[PDB]
Amino acid sequence: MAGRPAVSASSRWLEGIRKWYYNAAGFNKLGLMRDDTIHENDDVKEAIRRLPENLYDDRVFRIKRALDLSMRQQILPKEQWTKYEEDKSYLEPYLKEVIRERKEREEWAKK
Amino acid sequence: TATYAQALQSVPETQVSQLDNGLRVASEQSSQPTCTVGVWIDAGSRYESEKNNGAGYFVEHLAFKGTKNRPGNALEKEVESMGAHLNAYSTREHTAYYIKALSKDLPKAVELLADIVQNCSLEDSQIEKERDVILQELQENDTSMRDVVFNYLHATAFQGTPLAQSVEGPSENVRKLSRADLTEYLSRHYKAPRMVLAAAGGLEHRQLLDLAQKHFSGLSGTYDEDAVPTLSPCRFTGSQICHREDGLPLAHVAIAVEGPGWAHPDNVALQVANAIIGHYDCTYGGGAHLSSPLASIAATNKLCQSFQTFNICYADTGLLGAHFVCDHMSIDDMMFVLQGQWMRLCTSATESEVLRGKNLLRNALVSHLDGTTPVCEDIGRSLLTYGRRIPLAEWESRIAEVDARVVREVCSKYFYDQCPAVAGFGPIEQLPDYNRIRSGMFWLRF
Amino acid sequence: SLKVAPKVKATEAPAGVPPHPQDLEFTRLPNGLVIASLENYAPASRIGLFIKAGSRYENSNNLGTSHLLRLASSLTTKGASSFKITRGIEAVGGKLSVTSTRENMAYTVECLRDDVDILMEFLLNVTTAPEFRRWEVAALQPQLRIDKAVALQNPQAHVIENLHAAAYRNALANSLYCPDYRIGKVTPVELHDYVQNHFTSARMALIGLGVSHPVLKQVAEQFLNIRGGLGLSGAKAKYHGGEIREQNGDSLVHAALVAESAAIGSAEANAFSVLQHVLGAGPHVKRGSNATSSLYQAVAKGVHEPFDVSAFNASYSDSGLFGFYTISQAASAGDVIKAAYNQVKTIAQGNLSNPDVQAAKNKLKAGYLMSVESSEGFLDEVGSQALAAGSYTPPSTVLQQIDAVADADVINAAKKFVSGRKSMAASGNLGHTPFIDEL
Amino acid sequence: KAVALQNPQAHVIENLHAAAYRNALANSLYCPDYRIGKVTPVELHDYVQNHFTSARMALIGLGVSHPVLKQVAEQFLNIRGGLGLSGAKAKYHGGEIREQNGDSLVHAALVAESAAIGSAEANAFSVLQHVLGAGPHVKRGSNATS
Amino acid sequence: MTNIRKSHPLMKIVNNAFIDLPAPSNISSWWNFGSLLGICLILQILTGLFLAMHY
Amino acid sequence: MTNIRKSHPLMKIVNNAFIDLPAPSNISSWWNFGSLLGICLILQILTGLFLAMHY
Amino acid sequence: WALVADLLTLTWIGGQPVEHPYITIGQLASVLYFLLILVLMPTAGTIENKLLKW
Amino acid sequence: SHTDIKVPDFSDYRRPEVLDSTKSSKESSEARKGFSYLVTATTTVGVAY
Amino acid sequence: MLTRFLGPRYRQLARNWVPTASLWGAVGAVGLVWATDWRLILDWVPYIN
Amino acid sequence: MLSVAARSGPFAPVLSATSRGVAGALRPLVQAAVPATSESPVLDLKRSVLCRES
Ligand code: HEM
Ligand code: HEM
């Protein structure tokens, strides 16, 4: 149950479309996870500040080496890419709480 | 089964009775085994000219040092061995002497209170030794940043008027005060018509009235052609005093405008406005989550060490404003948001925050009377300012009639486009110029 | 208005129901929790949760956890967030304060009786189910330095901290504030351990002011599991006796010379309390000369300079500290301590008069009645009683106990202080302040 | 003071004399935390005028002829030391000071009252000091004789 | 005065030199020529530009 | 005398935006058009002024 | 790159006289220029946002 | 000793109506600010022309 | 305050600024008319007809 | 009589959300103020005393 609202996508089945898009996006070739490429607004920036030191420091190096790869216009070897199944959201739990906090704060103002 | 409104109705009603010479005997019956009784008199700095300024502080000091009946420390020894607490405070409009003891101890407490009032001794050695005492904490009071600033604010807000004098008075006036001035001050301001003897606790009103009839009957009123002197209005004066002293670490600044007065009904709406702005000083667990926008910003970026909103009420004037304590590089950053909050209520106040202010005012009145000691002060002081004493239920009726429209109208009448009085102390270099302060009273600048 | 000193009220013409007083309801739950609900029909309602989670219950490893736990209020919980708690409390005008002594930790909420149910949820969630998120605890950490700085600004608040440190090697010696090295070293794991161990039915009691018993009954006993076996406290303490002297160049010298006294509830503690007023432990007349104060009068002769002295009676559940606290100039610090100490020795030698005892009994009775006279003070009195003991004692019974103190017991209490092992804590300019061996 | 107190053994030794003595010898070698900035030039002049006065001095030189030392030293004072509330003549008291700072390693110093220098009893303690071992002689050794 | 003023990384701070700049109190009238010179400069440009549209 | 503390109380502090300004390492060639645009302005003004001396 | 190509189509057709082949192509290129940025591009971001579990 | 401070006499520069210390300053507050703003309003009117 | 509704507070804030916003638009209207003596506006005024 | 305030002994600091941090039970300081030497030290890094809720 993935891909498109239809039960079957254009290029057969539904789950493989997201897998196909992950390789098409190409941020795994740089050694970055999905949440390492997110837009840093006033919400995401706070949710980064709550990251544990072991996870925040890991994110820094993944970004640091990706810019080195982008500077040289290169990519990581085929064995060092971020697998689609092994990519996990290390920032979604923190984003959701800031979503919850901001929604309560915003709605409390209008009362 | 007992709602908030019903509980206010069940509060015992104050009983006020008048004596033959004009003494107002007031009490509130209760069930406590303890009680306090005190006498509130119309006296203070505002009633003293420049020549006898600070007599009340001098008089209050000698009040407990000896009477005609109990010379020396016998008056003090009677209270201490009895187990009672004796206290006395004096401000620019009132002075008081209240004693807290057991309910069964009421008959002796009233007898002592009459002796302090009618039979002050003022021994020649007592004045000389108390003169050096009064000259002592005057040096001490120089170190109180908050009290000095409010004295500065009073000096310039009501400059050239009796209300600008200090309760303690100038040091030179203290040195030159003699016994003749003190006894003249007593015989002019300590009269029955301008007096009220209040009490609260486990005491019957009949007992207090009879006790007052036994001891306070000797008090006299309408002494001479002066009889009961009348006050004169004091004119507020928009000004600014800046004692810049860089040695002191923090800056205390108080800015206020003329208030309505004691009897003006606009005090309720103004007290709701102050509750909305609130208070905060560097020790609240709320931090950035505090409901008051001024407190939330002041805590988010650490603007002030302290700040509070006050409404000082007098017979026909007042000092409605705020006082804040901050760094030497935060005066402009908070005076800008302090006045910005004032202009918000005058222009755009929402009903939700007025409801927060109304609830805050509701708790202030109910929780202030946490015993017999604050009740008698409320009973005694009201009978000198409001005339009658306002029941708590009546206060709720006036509070429930305040809304956003009232707050917007009331605030815009005393705050918007009015000349404020500014008092500073410490490192006030950053403190903005008065024209910058004055122009902050209005928005849109056009 | 009604139950603001005795928990039994005099008849006041039953009519209307709010204008009528009633008795007091005291119950103990099967799990050990204690509920003491009151209905004084006052406009304001006050609820307090009293816990045996004082600063003494911290061991050496987790010092300062109680201080951070005291500041830990108004933080995100499992039912209400930090924003919701701060906004929800202030919207109804209520207040939320945490009182913590060395033994107890009281969670008090004050509001109007119309919205006491809202204050119930914000109290249990804060007290029982805190999330203790790592970022929030880290952000609240620098407040420890700010709170300790202002609280230690008063010079006599620091001598008391050293007084217990010098007198004990154990629980009671822990200061009420996080140590200078622990600011930043506290972790959410320690806070969860402290909460889990020290928040239990057997060490908690719920006290209300203007609330029905079933309302309090239904909101008490949910998830209390284990006692405070983490360390130090929960397994008794012991008294040491020492001397701590700190110099800071201050103009005024604060000295506290105490000894070992008896614990609360014990009949010997009452002997010290009435002895505390024989020596004089606070002025009664503003700007008075303290004629009846034996300590102040004793030092009045000889010392003709500003000074201050009063008795000190710190009593606890397991032990106590009794002695005198003095303030004097460094030029004559030793004279004031020695003169005040010699006066106590005269009391121990039987040089006491019955009228002196009678006045002290009157001061003790009056001082106690006004202490519980206030609504806030009344809650603290019963709240600690429901923790130290298992039931409430009416003030009339307390007055009888004070009146049942023989004059011989006062002399014996004085002998215990004089002959005991002293514990001296001093501060200021200690050039002339004597040591323990110099009396 | 901050750098000199980085070594945890310095703090204990300063506290050891504070706990043991009440008089002169209990004074720490570093300015107290409250005195930083409270010292005044008049105090320094009084300290110099009282203690920097010949009979408490001694001039020692290496590789310099005696007349050079003798001539340069004939310009000194004739004063002695003063009095002191906390420093003058030392008298042993004996106490106990305990400081907690959460450090991993615990430093403890338990001492009694020995004899002063010159006295034959001081030599007895000094030889007793090496009986118990007062410092390694073999790098990374197991201290068999200690 | 309305808020904490928030923001600030803009060109307004460059304009603090025209609003919040400290200045001596006893500055005489011989000093308006500094601002007068700026008035003269932008006046020549204003009139000069319209002159250059027909010259 | 601190070589890093250069003639700061001058216009060089503004020029620190041209020398010590932090810039991303992975800047591609498409960013060069920012500096090219400034050169286009200067070139157009330089040639324009000399054109205006005969037009 | 469809927008860039369309912008080149607009540039190519701008310099040509208004006749029947360039009237049809001119309208289609112009209507696509606004349609891409206003509709297709914002819809493109929404589709991928769903495609990346966020 | 801070009570020894007294605001000096400003009656030399004081407006005639606020000269009297007994009379309240709120009676003429509308007109004291009205006259000053009248100057500003008339200056902007002239500049607008 | 009522159970966190949807935009009641901003409606109250808007109503406060409506009377001034309506009068502020007069400056934009009259000022623009004053700038260029617009023909069909300077016909209802009695003095400037 | 089982409390920390009735005996007027040890200390009981208070931390609040709508009130100031108040610490201190009865101990001798009032009688020192009458022979005034305790100068009420400056509010250097200090909050406002006596609180504000009544
Ligand atoms: C600091 C700036 C300037 C100064 C001091 C200045 C000065 C002068 C002077 C003294 C004249 C002689 C006029 C006469 O004697 O009749 C003149 C003429 C002229 N200026 Fe400038 N000028 C300035 C800026 C400009 C600018 C910015 C422009 C065009 C954008 C301009 C355009 C002209 C023209 C077209 C004339 C000839 C027309 C005439 O003389 O009336 N000027 N200028
Ligand atoms: C961003 C700045 C400028 C742009 C984009 C620009 C653009 C142009 C263009 C497209 C032409 C048409 C030339 C042709 O088709 O033959 C032109 C002509 C001209 N420009 Fe500019 N110009 C700029 C600045 C200036 C300046 C600063 C001056 C004078 C100081 C100037 C003076 C002239 C003159 C005199 C001509 C006519 C001579 C000629 O066409 O060769 N231009 N300009």
> Quick check: B162 and B232 in contact, CB under 8 A?
yes
Cα(B230)–Cα(B46) distance, integer angstroms: 11
Angle (CA) B235-B236-B241 rounded to 5° is: 130
Superfamily designation of domain B14-227: Metalloenzyme, LuxS/M16 peptidase-like (3.30.830.10)
3 state SS of B40? strand
Distance between first and last Cα of chain G: 25
- Nearest ligand, CA E52: 1
Q: Pick from B61, B102, B367: which is nearest to C44 by CB?
A: B367
Pocket test for ligand 2, best of F51, F53, F54, F55 (most atoms within 8 A of CB): F51
What is the distance in angstroms between the Cα of A22 and the nearest Cα belonging to chain G? 8
**Does any CB of chain C come closer than 8 Å to the CB of residue A101?**
yes
**Does any CB of chain A come closer than 8 Å to the CB of residue I13?**
no
- B37 phi and psi angles, rounded to 5 deg: -130, 140
**Own/partner pairs, D98-104, CB within 8 angstroms, 24+ separation:** D99/D11, D99/D15, D100/C60, D100/C63, D100/C179, D100/C181, D101/C181, D102/C181, D102/C182, D102/C185, D103/D8
d(CA B392, ligand 1 centre) in Å: 80
Please say whether the dihedral angle defined by the alpha carbons of residues B76, B80, B81 and B82, taken in this order, is positive or negative. Answer: positive
Report strand pairing: B304-313 vs C44-51: unpaired
**Does any CB of chain F come closer than 8 Å to the CB of residue A71?**
yes
The DSSP symbol for D116 reads P
Q: How far is CA C248 from the centre of its chain?
A: 27
Pocket test for ligand 1, best of E43, E49, E51 (most atoms within 8 A of CB): E51
Cα(C261)–Cα(B188) distance, integer angstroms: 55
Size of interface A-I (CB pairs under 8 A): 19
Residue nearest (by alpha carbon) to ligand 2 atom 10: F44
The DSSP symbol for D21 reads B
Nearest alpha-carbon partner for C252 in A109, B228, J33: J33
d(CA C368, ligand 1 centre) in Å: 94
- Chain C touching partners, 3 or more CB pairs below 8 A: A, B, D, J
CB atoms within 10 A of CB G9: 17
Residue nearest (by alpha carbon) to ligand 2 atom 11: F48
Tell me if B14-227 shares its fold with B239-442.
yes
Say whether B343 and E2 touch across the interface (CB within 8 A). Answer: yes
Point out the catalytic residue in the list B60, B78, B409, B429. Answer: B60
Contacts of D53 (CB under 8 A, 6+ apart): D76, D77, D78, D79, D80, D81
- For residue E23, list chain B residues with Cβ-Cβ distance below 8 A: none
Is B78 marked active-site? no
Q: Which residues of D104-114 are buried (b: 16+ CB within 10 A; e: fewer)?
A: eeeeeeeeeee
Name the class of domain H1-49.
Answer: mainly alpha
> Quick check: B41 and B189 in contact, CB under 8 A?
yes
Cα(C108)–Cα(C130) distance, integer angstroms: 17
Polymer length in residues for chain A: 111
Polymer length in residues for chain C: 439
Q: F14: Cβ below 6 Å to ligand 2?
A: no
Sheet holding C307-315, edge to edge: C243-245, C423-427, C252-261, C320-329, C307-315
Say whether F24 and A68 touch across the interface (CB within 8 A). Answer: no
- B286 phi and psi angles, rounded to 5 deg: -65, -45
> Quick check: C133 and C61 in contact, CB under 8 A?
no
Cα(C84)–Cα(C302) distance, integer angstroms: 61
What is the distance in angstroms between the Cα of B256 and the nearest Cα belonging to chain H? 15
The DSSP symbol for D136 reads -
Q: Which residue of A has its CA nearest to F28?
A: A71
This structure's resolution (angstroms)?
Answer: 3.0
d(CA F48, ligand 2 centre) in Å: 6
CA dihedral C418, C422, C425, C429 (to 10 degrees): 60
Angle between helices B74-82 and B106-118 (to 10 degrees): 160
3 state SS of I20? helix
**Does any CB of chain A come closer than 8 Å to the CB of residue G54?**
yes
Any idea where the domains of chain B sit in the sequence?
Answer: 14-227, 239-442
Q: Among all chains, which residue has been given the structure tokens 């017979």? A: B315
Any idea where the domains of chain H sit in the sequence?
Answer: 1-49
In chain E, helix, strand, coil percent, each to 5? 55, 0, 45
Nearest alpha-carbon partner for B145 in C250, J49, J30: J49
Q: Pick from C97, C154, C308: which is nearest to J24 by CB?
A: C154
Cα(B103)–Cα(B29) distance, integer angstroms: 11
Q: Where do the H-state alpha helices sit in chain A? A: 15-25, 44-49, 53-71, 92-109
Cα(C216)–Cα(C383) distance, integer angstroms: 14
Contact residues of ligand 1, CB 6 A cut-off: E 41, 44-45, 48-49, 51-52, 55
Name the class of domain B239-442.
Answer: alpha beta
Atom of ligand 2 nearest to the CA of F49: 30
Q: How far is CA B310 from the centre of its chain?
A: 10
Say whether E1 and B337 touch across the interface (CB within 8 A). Answer: yes
Cα(B141)–Cα(C78) distance, integer angstroms: 49
Say whether I12 and B347 touch across the interface (CB within 8 A). Answer: no
- Chain I touching partners, 3 or more CB pairs below 8 A: A, B
Residue nearest (by alpha carbon) to ligand 1 atom 30: E49
Contacts of C117 (CB under 8 A, 6+ apart): C215
**Identity of residue C271:** A
* Concatenated DSSP letters of B301-341: TT-EEEEEEEEEE-SS-EEEEEEEEE-TTSHHHHHHHHHHH
Cα(C294)–Cα(C339) distance, integer angstroms: 11
Q: F38: Cβ below 6 Å to ligand 2?
A: no
Cα(C296)–Cα(A40) distance, integer angstroms: 68
**Identity of residue B317:** T
Contacts of E29 (CB under 8 A, 6+ apart): none
Interface test with A, best of I1, I3, I4 (most A CBs within 10 A): I4
Cα(C432)–Cα(C253) distance, integer angstroms: 10
Q: Which H or E element spans position C427?
A: strand C423-427
Cα(J49)–Cα(J51) distance, integer angstroms: 5
Cα(A109)–Cα(A86) distance, integer angstroms: 41
Q: Which residue of C has its CA nearest to D21?
A: C435
d(CA E52, ligand 1 centre) in Å: 9
Pocket test for ligand 2, best of F36, F44, F47 (most atoms within 8 A of CB): F44
**Does any CB of chain C come closer than 8 Å to the CB of residue A50?**
yes
d(CA H49, ligand 1 centre) in Å: 27
Q: Which residue of C has its CA nearest to J45?
A: C150
Q: How far is CA J42 from the centre of its chain?
A: 15
- Nearest ligand, CA F52: 2
d(CA F53, ligand 2 centre) in Å: 12
d(CA E49, ligand 2 centre) in Å: 17
Cα(C326)–Cα(J17) distance, integer angstroms: 34
Residue nearest (by alpha carbon) to ligand 2 atom 18: F48
Cα(B341)–Cα(E33) distance, integer angstroms: 40
The DSSP symbol for F11 reads I
Residue nearest (by alpha carbon) to ligand 1 atom 25: E48
For D131, the token pair is: 């009986």
Q: Pick from B160, B166, B241: which is nearest to H3 by CB?
A: B166
Cα(C365)–Cα(D22) distance, integer angstroms: 44
Say whether J15 and B306 touch across the interface (CB within 8 A). Answer: no
Residue nearest (by alpha carbon) to ligand 2 atom 22: F44
> Quick check: H20 and B235 in contact, CB under 8 A?
yes
Say whether A52 and C83 touch across the interface (CB within 8 A). Answer: no
Please say whether the dihedral angle defined by the alpha carbons of residues C281, C286, C287 and C293, taken in this order, is positive or negative. Answer: negative
* Domains, chain A: 12-110 (1.10.1090.10)
Check chain C for breaks (C–N over 2.5 Å) and list the residue before each, or none.
none
Cα(F26)–Cα(A74) distance, integer angstroms: 11
Sheet holding C95-100, edge to edge: C25-28, C34-37, C204-209, C44-51, C105-112, C95-100, J14-16
- For residue B283, list chain C residues with Cβ-Cβ distance below 8 A: 146-147, 150
Cα(D23)–Cα(D84) distance, integer angstroms: 9
Cα(B286)–Cα(B304) distance, integer angstroms: 15
Cα(A97)–Cα(A50) distance, integer angstroms: 11
